[PDB]
Amino acid sequence: TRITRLQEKEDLQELNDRLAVYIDRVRSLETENAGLRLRITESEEVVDFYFGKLRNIELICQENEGENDPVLQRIVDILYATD
Amino acid sequence: STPLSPTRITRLQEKEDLQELNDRLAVYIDRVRSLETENAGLRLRITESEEVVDFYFGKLRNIELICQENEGENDPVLQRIVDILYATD
């Protein structure tokens, strides 16, 4: 096929329409991406906060092993339990 | 050019006319593909991080309950642990 300048004009409009839709999708995905990066940073800060508490409790239990305290022994079993 | 005999072009001349626009479309399509993949990886990473938060939080809550249940002992070591549990920053 050889094509009219009018069919080209409509072909150009089609491409411009799809370009607008893909730009919208980029904007939506960039906003989502920014929110996910914030959420992972905040979640990792909570992990570090809680992990620090567990490490300090571990140190207190280790320092008091001489006491032979069954309550501290139960806490050590919680600290060292797997998932 | 008349309405009977309009200017008519090859699909190759059209390709060269539209090539710049098709190149810009390709930039945004590839950006969509890259961002969709990134976002899927981030959603998995947040699920795994939230599971670790729940795991550690469960340990802290269970230790809290044991400390509360033994408050009658007046044990300064348990009091140090409760200080850790209830401490900020």
Short mmCIF file of C-alpha atoms in Angstrom, two decimals, chain A residues 7-80:
data_model
loop_
_atom_site.label_atom_id
_atom_site.label_comp_id
_atom_site.label_asym_id
_atom_site.label_seq_id
_atom_site.Cartn_x
_atom_site.Cartn_y
_atom_site.Cartn_z
CA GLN A 7 -4.07 8.16 6.88
CA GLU A 8 -0.55 9.24 8.08
CA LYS A 9 -2.16 12.10 10.15
CA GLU A 10 -4.50 9.52 11.81
CA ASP A 11 -1.50 7.09 12.26
CA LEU A 12 0.36 10.00 14.00
CA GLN A 13 -2.69 10.73 16.26
CA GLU A 14 -2.82 6.98 17.25
CA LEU A 15 0.90 7.03 18.24
CA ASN A 16 0.46 10.31 20.21
CA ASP A 17 -2.59 8.76 22.05
CA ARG A 18 -0.53 5.64 23.04
CA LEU A 19 2.42 7.88 24.09
CA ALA A 20 0.03 9.81 26.44
CA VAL A 21 -1.23 6.50 28.00
CA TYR A 22 2.35 5.20 28.55
CA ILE A 23 3.39 8.56 30.12
CA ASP A 24 0.39 8.18 32.53
CA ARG A 25 1.56 4.62 33.36
CA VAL A 26 5.14 5.92 34.05
CA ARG A 27 3.70 8.63 36.39
CA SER A 28 1.56 6.03 38.29
CA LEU A 29 4.52 3.56 38.58
CA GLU A 30 6.95 6.33 39.72
CA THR A 31 4.51 7.36 42.49
CA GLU A 32 4.06 3.69 43.54
CA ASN A 33 7.89 3.13 43.43
CA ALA A 34 8.51 6.20 45.69
CA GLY A 35 5.89 4.93 48.22
CA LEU A 36 7.38 1.39 48.21
CA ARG A 37 10.94 2.75 48.80
CA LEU A 38 9.63 4.80 51.80
CA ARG A 39 7.75 1.73 53.17
CA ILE A 40 10.88 -0.54 52.92
CA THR A 41 13.10 2.14 54.63
CA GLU A 42 10.52 2.52 57.51
CA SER A 43 10.10 -1.31 57.84
CA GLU A 44 13.94 -1.80 57.92
CA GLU A 45 14.17 0.90 60.69
CA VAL A 46 11.54 -1.02 62.76
CA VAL A 47 13.51 -4.31 62.18
CA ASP A 48 16.74 -2.59 63.44
CA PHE A 49 14.90 -1.05 66.46
CA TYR A 50 13.41 -4.44 67.53
CA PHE A 51 16.65 -6.33 66.76
CA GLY A 52 18.57 -3.88 69.02
CA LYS A 53 16.13 -4.58 71.88
CA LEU A 54 16.51 -8.37 71.38
CA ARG A 55 20.38 -8.05 71.35
CA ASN A 56 20.33 -5.97 74.60
CA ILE A 57 18.02 -8.57 76.27
CA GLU A 58 20.37 -11.35 75.04
CA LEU A 59 23.36 -9.53 76.69
CA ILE A 60 21.42 -9.17 80.02
CA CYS A 61 20.56 -12.92 79.97
CA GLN A 62 24.21 -13.89 79.17
CA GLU A 63 25.53 -11.59 81.96
CA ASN A 64 23.19 -13.27 84.52
CA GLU A 65 23.71 -16.97 83.58
CA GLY A 66 25.45 -17.36 87.03
CA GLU A 67 22.02 -16.69 88.73
CA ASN A 68 20.65 -20.04 87.39
CA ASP A 69 17.26 -18.22 86.90
CA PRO A 70 14.69 -20.40 85.00
CA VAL A 71 12.84 -17.21 83.90
CA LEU A 72 16.02 -15.90 82.13
CA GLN A 73 16.55 -19.42 80.73
CA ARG A 74 13.00 -19.30 79.18
CA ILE A 75 13.78 -15.85 77.71
CA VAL A 76 17.05 -17.19 76.14
CA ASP A 77 14.98 -20.05 74.60
CA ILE A 78 12.62 -17.39 73.07
CA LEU A 79 15.62 -15.33 71.77
CA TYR A 80 17.25 -18.38 70.08
#
